[PDB]
């Protein structure tokens, strides 16, 4: 829709993408620590 809503949406999208990545990093860090010695 409008300029302002497009801004809000884009920010909401970046936030959702960031939490997904953050969750992936945590899991990847655990697996590697399980792998470790």
């Amino acid at each position: 829709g409008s300029e302002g809503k497009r801004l809000t949406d884009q920010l909401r999208w970046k936030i959702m993408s960031l939490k997904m990545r953050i969750e992936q990093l945590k899991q990847t860090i655990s697996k590697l620590n399980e792998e470790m010695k």
Binding site: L7, T8, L11, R12, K14, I15, L18, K19, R21, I22, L25, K26, T28, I29, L32, N33, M36
Partner: peptide, 28 residues
């Protein structure tokens, strides 16, 4: 609203950057 969302974004970016560092540190 936008201000709140930007704040939240900044926090998650900081948290991301910590985690990437933490991944780096497991190897080294």
């Amino acid at each position: 609203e936008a201000a709140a969302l930007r704040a939240e974004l900044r926090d998650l970016e900081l948290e991301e950057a910590r985690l990437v560092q933490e991944l780096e540190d497991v190897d080294r």
